Amino acid sequence: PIVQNLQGQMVHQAISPRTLNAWVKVVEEKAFSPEVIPMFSALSEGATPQDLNTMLNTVGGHQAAMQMLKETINEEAAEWDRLHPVHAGPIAPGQMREPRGSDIAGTTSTLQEQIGWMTHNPPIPVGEIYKRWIILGLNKIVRMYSPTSILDIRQGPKEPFRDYVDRFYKTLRAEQASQEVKNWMTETLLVQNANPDCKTILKALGPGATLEEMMTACQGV
Amino acid sequence: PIVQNLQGQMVHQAISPRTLNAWVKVVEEKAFSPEVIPMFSALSEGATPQDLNTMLNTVGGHQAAMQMLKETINEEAAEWDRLHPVHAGPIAPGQMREPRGSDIAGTTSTLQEQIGWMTHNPPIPVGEIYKRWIILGLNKIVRMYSPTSILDIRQGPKEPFRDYVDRFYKTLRAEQASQEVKNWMTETLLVQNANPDCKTILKALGPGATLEEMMTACQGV
Amino acid sequence: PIVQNLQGQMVHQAISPRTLNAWVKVVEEKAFSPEVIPMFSALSEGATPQDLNTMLNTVGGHQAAMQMLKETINEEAAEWDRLHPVHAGPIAPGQMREPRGSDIAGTTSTLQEQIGWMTHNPPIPVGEIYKRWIILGLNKIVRMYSPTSILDIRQGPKEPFRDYVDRFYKTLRAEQASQEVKNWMTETLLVQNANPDCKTILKALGPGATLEEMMTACQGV
Amino acid sequence: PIVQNLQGQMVHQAISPRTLNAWVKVVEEKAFSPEVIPMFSALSEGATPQDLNTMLNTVGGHQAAMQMLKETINEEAAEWDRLHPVHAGPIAPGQMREPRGSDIAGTTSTLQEQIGWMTHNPPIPVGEIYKRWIILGLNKIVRMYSPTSILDIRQGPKEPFRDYVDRFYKTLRAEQASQEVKNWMTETLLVQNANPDCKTILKALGPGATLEEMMTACQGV
Amino acid sequence: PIVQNLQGQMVHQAISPRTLNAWVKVVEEKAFSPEVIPMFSALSEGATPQDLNTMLNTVGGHQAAMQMLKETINEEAAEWDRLHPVHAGPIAPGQMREPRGSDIAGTTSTLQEQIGWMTHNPPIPVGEIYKRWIILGLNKIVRMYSPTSILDIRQGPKEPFRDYVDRFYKTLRAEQASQEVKNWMTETLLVQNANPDCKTILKALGPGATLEEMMTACQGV
Amino acid sequence: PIVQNLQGQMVHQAISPRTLNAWVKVVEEKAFSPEVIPMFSALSEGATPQDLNTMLNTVGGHQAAMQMLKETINEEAAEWDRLHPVHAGPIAPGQMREPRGSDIAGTTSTLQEQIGWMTHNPPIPVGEIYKRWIILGLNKIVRMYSPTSILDIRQGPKEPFRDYVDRFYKTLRAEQASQEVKNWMTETLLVQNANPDCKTILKALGPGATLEEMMTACQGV
């Protein structure tokens, strides 16, 4: 990554072995969890695009998902080129040249360009742009590994109601809609696909009952 | 998080892999325990609200509680706006504008704005304010995942005194009520619902007795 | 804790996640061993009192014993207040106010008071004073949870002498006793309540014999 | 490894126990799979040749592959000699005379000479040179221990599409070609050797479509 | 402990969490093997007497041995007083006072004196002296916990000869006497108590044959 | 250890507790494979002779091999004494004496004597000399814990050739001999003791084949 310190000191650093291991291990034991996307965001503070690409490379298995992520990055790099073509011209030693999309995706990632972009003012935010494209590719993958229809999420008679709520809101987190459509799922689907008696208990509270009211009401009395 | 270096000099840092994994693991094994709230305080000493939000979102599982916490945070953010209307008009060049509720919860915010609040004068503690709201949501969650009412706690005939006193104090930690009221609970309930023979012993010790005295008097059943 | 760097530069630091994890695991998994008191002392050096309280409070389970420690801490706060009444009237600035007992246990404290007390010369060693109160409380818990009366410990018939000596000296560490009382216990109880076969051999050996000599006599007995 | 201190002061550090153990573990779980190449590059961010030799030699098992790597390193040293025959005539001790392949690979060269070459400026970047020779040899091992030919991979009558894609892209990952040749393999073979029920669905979808579209269409059998 | 930092700088520090944890694990898991002595010395490099006392005191379990070690430290403290008495009078600020044996053992573990002794020019090596007393007691414990008579130890008929030799020399390292006695025991018992077939070869190698020759000779016997 | 830090500043350091633990548990779980020597080099960089002796002593189990190593070191110490007889007289102040074998092998070398050797000019690398002696003894141990003669190793009629080549090259590493002799064994024995089918393919590559060619050729049976 690149680390800033007190007294304005800025150092590129190698990726710590333990950080790399932790990322490989989340994929090994939990695959493309819902927890994974934000975990990637936490580990990628201050990253270089080249090292982020190395982190994608070390993932074991699940190579169909890895291809979908690579395609997602490639599509976004082409969009960047269409809006922001790198214009011709010589530049002085000590100056920066604007990024093109495949340089951001890491194919021609000189370590010096990456350091130079971060230590120019204003910063040339290649790490943020690359991370965002990776996040978009991950969101596709999480939906793919959340195979169950939202309309098929139902409380059994053996489930405590709270477990059904846990499944429902995990599924919505990994299968977005517009903010309005998701709000409609909370107000329509959640009561509808509860077990009959629990569903009756929620209806008495109302159609816009808070989740706090729903949790307190349905525990067993 | 936010480190405070030698001579009080303050810089945003990446989190350790091992901090992230430890927080994720305690939630994975124990849920939102009663132990979790002080552990969250220990891990969060100096942090931007966006990073704190990252810490909340890297938890998966237990999503009925997690959604309830997000709604609770949103209500508290609205209270901040009601109390502290944010100036829509102009500000002096260099003076930071008050935070609004969305900024405190990172939802409508840049990381640099958040750092600005922690580094300007005054160094408005937006990270501390966001943690206070997260803690309140967690305390409600801890009461939700309690499954025992303090008013029902009874020592059996065969149950030893030691088991009963452990249930009573564990439950009292999860009573999200006034601390003064908890003192009333210690004086009143603990003696009243003891095993009949041992209640007689505790009444004889009478008001002002220490727990040390109660435990030695009631060794056994 | 507080980390002291080269050139007398003393900076308060975060609780190490890993140090806190070690403390919670010992109390939860090993309970109120004899090993707990010294392990606590080693990990609680150089602690700002509110953080030291966080370290106590992030331990859970055993909640009657934990409450008994909090009560013991409050008794010590009562002694501290009686011994050192507050300096009445207007408090002159610069010099930190001399604390009350609740403030020392941390409930009312600010981080700025805590830094001020430790970084003044002379210092007010608030973290040490609180640590002494806590260690006294732990000794009370270890005594309370080692209910075997040392006078009554006997050997079985099919026991080697060593297992009895291990039990005897563990019990002695968890019994209230001056060094003079320990010396009497050592020379009175230990050989008298031994298994008949070993006790015959030890009496023939005599009283001046050390424990090293006694262990040598009873190798297979 | 080499650690860059403040102001560019390069100081060698001992091999880290936990870096070395991490390399040994990746070899234990996965052997010489295509994950090895990026994992090796990440752990050799700052490696000396001495570290690199220690890393190769500590592997247990897999000794046919390890011997093949060492011969491949011998081949690369011979290519270095052919390109860069070391000029005749005398050069003082201390002047960093050019190395030949055998010094670079490090058997016939002190650690201190190697550190001198990489850390004086301008350098003769022996650590990077040797690391590259290892990477070329590893790429051949990765091809050798791929066991499936891409032409033969069929999606069975019972195999799910996701697993067929996983197999195909691991196999391509371990038998890399020119980027254009790889792109042709993705457009031609993957659709063609899909199960016949799903291949029709893909032809309807397009004349070669994105993998994200292909995964959505082929969610059955 | 005391650490020397770069440039001959003495800094007193806390006992490392991790060093103390490792020492506590050694006594929980491995009892008083002959491996304990050197492990303890290595983890206690740099220790004040107060730190050494903290390490002894964190041991629980096996408490008869621990009590014997404390008595043994007291016996050495009495030998130190007998050799070296204390002279009357005051000492200047800037001088070191000669310690009683109890002071070296850490009974009045005044840390200021202890740091003073190791950092004065020239020093009193109080911490090393205490370590030698601890080591003497630990050796006595190692003999106590190695109950098997070495004179009974023979080769199994089913055992490989080499495993019998491993047992014999571990036992001799646990019960060590004069070097003269150990050497004679190694010559005499090891050959006599082997298998018939193996011992016949060893005598034919000579009446002083090396352990190296003995190992090569008995592979396949 | 002795750490040579930036700008040549040599400072003595404590043994790392994590370094020591990694060495000890490698030996106890994996014993003396032909992984041991390089692993020993990784964990002993910059050791003093005293540290090296600590590192061996701390290991236990497999004690007949450990005594054999101690004598191999004693034989080397006698060779050093024969080349570097004990000299008498005063010596220059600052120009440490030429060691004798007992100092190199640690017992007679105080911390001040060893520090003297590495910190005077010109420096005498007593730690390295002792490390080379230990490594020589380890190579003897590794051969003793090889069980298989390289001249017996053959590929079955049904064993895969891939397993045979792995077995051959592990065994060849654990025979003591010149690397040049090992090279002749690789080109002579391995083809001769393959199975008829594989051997016929190998002889069509003829004299000069690399393992990369040979392994690729025999992927078919």
Describe the structure.
Chains A, B, C, D, E, F: It is found in: Virion. Chains A, B, C, D, E, F: Residues 145-221 are annotated as: Dimerization/Multimerization of capsid protein p24. 6 copies of one chain form a homohexamer. The first copy, chain A, is mostly helical and 221 residues long. Chain A has 2 domains: 2-144, Human Immunodeficiency Virus Type 1 Capsid Protein (Orthogonal Bundle), CATH 1.10.375; 150-217, Non-ribosomal Peptide Synthetase Peptidyl Carrier Protein, Chain A (Orthogonal Bundle), CATH 1.10.1200. Chain A is built from 11 helices and 2 strands. Chain A has helices spanning 17-30, 36-43, 49-58, 63-83, 101-104, 111-119, 126-144, 161-173, 179-192, 196-205, 211-217, and strands at residues 2-4, 10-12. A two-stranded antiparallel ribbon of chain A has the order 1-2. In chain A, a hairpin with a 5-residue loop joins strand 1 and strand 2 (10-12). In chain A, helix 1 packs antiparallel against helix 2 and helix 4 crosses helix 7 (126-144). Chain A is elongated, with a radius of gyration of 23 Å. Chain A starts with a strand and ends with a helix. The relative contact order of chain A is 0.10. Chains in contact: A-B, A-D, B-C, C-E, D-F, E-F. The B-C interface holds B 1, 3-8, 16, 18-19, 22, 33-35, 38-39, 41-43, 45-46, 162, 165-166, 168-170, 173, 210-212, 215-216, 219 and C 5, 9, 11-15, 17-18, 20-21, 24, 51, 54-55, 57-64, 66-68, 71-72, 140, 144, 147.
